[PDB]
A paper describes a structure:
Vibrio dual lipases/transferases (VDLTs, e.g., VPA0226 of Vibrio parahaemolyticus, lec/VC_A0218 of Vibrio cholera, and VvPlpA of Vibrio vulnificus) are a class of virulence factors secreted by Vibrio pathogens to disrupt host membrane structures. Therefore, VDLTs are enzymes with unusual dual substrate and catalytic promiscuity, which could benefit pathogens in handling diverse host lipid molecules in a proper manner. Crystal structures of the VDLT from Vibrio alginolyticus (ValDLT) and its fatty acid complexes were solved, revealing prominent structural flexibility.
We also solved the structures of ValDLT in complex with arachidonic acid (ARA) and docosahexaenoic acid (DHA), two other long-chain fatty acids (LCFAs) that can be transferred to cholesterol. ARA and DHA are buried slightly deeper in the acyl-binding pocket than OLA due to their longer hydrocarbon chains, and in general, the two complexes share similarity with ValDLT/OLA in active site conformation and ligand interactions. Their tails follow a similar tracking path with certain differences in zigzag detail, and their carboxyl groups are in the same position with similar orientation.
Residue numbers in the entry: 29 to 418
The structure:
């Protein structure tokens, strides 16, 4: 994807950069608003990281450093000095106030034990941690009502999984239900796989066998692009073929929840609902066949039935720690992509119960309590990832 000559030239172009530490301003997960501060050292001087920059034709610049994610995290926690359990700290590389949020890749050591040491996420808005946020010039999704480019009031399921295992998370996921395709073109799983393959050729001592891959895709295609079941099946199979041929060995796979149970479908016709629900059911049977196909070949596959979990969550939310599974927490009573540009109050029922008792944050996307509940159910069912080496 990148020539040997291009790789050394980029890696030898050594420099330094600063770290932007982001945090939730409120102690409540009902308030999505965030702010940032520059990372500092305990003596009060600016915290810098050494390394090199690289971007493909896409021009999403990634900073590659030898400094670990744990060290950078610790610097942010110490700089911010918040006694907020909901601070939900995230960090990025940035030369100054004009710079956007660049992901920092912590390069592995040549001496690497045979165990997972990072999570790589592919998919849609159910996994996106901010890939549309820089392109939108930090205006979409509106950072007062959506948590720093996450289509939720906080962390998504991949972030809870990565945190539970104390691993860094590198995100290639990006959705379409919110009109994301008006800000970045190349959002298909195929383009995400190509991007991942391109950026990891610039990483040092990269062993794909030590990556835990998460993949969830198909709802964007069925809901927003009216794609046929065979073409989504073919893309899903192609992503796994491409990844396994590129040394991937560890996967967290999942069935698609019935998206028609989301609040936005209150405004859809029954014919539209029945078409989407039926496509989800055939895709789920193919996802199970694919998980079994790779499992039979000796790959480490964890398959979670999110569909069956979601059916239980919506039929009896009271049994799963929720009061409402039908309505958004935000006071959004239509399905209009322009609503992602504005600040919204919480509807009375959600203001009263708190966002952690609502399944949905907006008309499409689940709350961070739902994301954590899924992440915890995934970790339990796979016995804190029993077939994976940590
Ligand atoms: C594939 C699901 C696996 C993990 C994601 C974690 C939690 C999801 C939990 C419950 C289901 C919630 C909502 C279903 C409704 C809509 C999905 C939303 C967006 C997908 C399409 C897009 O981003 O364009």
């Amino acid at each position: 994807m990148v020539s040997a000559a291009e790789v050394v030239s980029a890696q030898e172009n050594q420099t330094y950069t600063y770290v932007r530490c982001w945090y939730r301003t409120s102690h409540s997960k009902d308030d999505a608003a965030t702010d940032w501060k520059w990372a500092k050292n305990q003596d009060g001087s600016d915290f810098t990281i050494d390394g090199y920059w690289w971007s493909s034709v896409s021009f999403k610049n990634m900073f590659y450093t030898n400094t670990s994610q744990n060290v950078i995290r610790q610097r942010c926690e110490e700089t911010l000095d918040l006694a907020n359990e909901n601070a939900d700290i995230t960090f990025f590389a940035a030369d100054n106030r004009y710079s956007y949020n660049h992901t920092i890749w912590s390069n592995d050591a040549a001496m690497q034990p045979d165990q997972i040491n990072k999570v790589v996420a592919l998919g849609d808005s159910l996994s996106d941690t901010g890939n549309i946020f820089n392109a939108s010039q930090w205006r979409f999704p509106n950072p007062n009502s959506w948590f720093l480019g996450h289509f939720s009031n906080g962390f998504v399921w991949t972030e809870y999984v990565a945190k539970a295992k104390n691993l860094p998370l590198y995100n290639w996921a990006v959705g379409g239900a919110a009109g994301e395709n008006q800000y970045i073109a190349l959002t298909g799983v195929g383009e995400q796989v190509s991007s991942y393959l391109t950026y990891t050729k610039l990483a040092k001592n990269y062993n794909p066998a030590n990556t835990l891959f998460t993949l969830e895709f198909g709802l964007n295609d069925f809901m927003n692009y009216n794609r046929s079941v065979p073409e989504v099946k073919a893309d899903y199979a192609e992503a796994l073929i491409r990844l396994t041929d590129a040394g991937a060995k560890n996967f967290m796979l999942m069935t698609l929840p019935d998206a028609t149970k989301a609040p936005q479908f209150k405004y859809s016709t029954q014919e539209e609902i029945e078409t989407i629900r039926a496509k989800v059911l055939k895709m789920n049977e193919f996802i199970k066949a694919q998980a079994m196909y790779y499992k039979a070949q000796g790959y480490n596959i964890a398959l979670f039935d999110t569909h069956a979990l979601f059916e239980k969550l919506t039929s009896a939310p009271e049994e799963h720690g929720f009061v409402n599974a039908s309505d958004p927490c935000l006071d959004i009573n239509r399905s209009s992509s322009v609503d992602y540009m504005y600040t919204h109050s919480l509807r009375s029922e959600c203001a009263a119960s708190g966002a952690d008792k609502f399944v949905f944050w907006d008309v499409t996307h689940p709350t961070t309590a739902t994301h954590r509940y899924v992440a915890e159910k995934m970790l339990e069912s796979s016995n804190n990832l029993e077939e994976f080496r940590f």
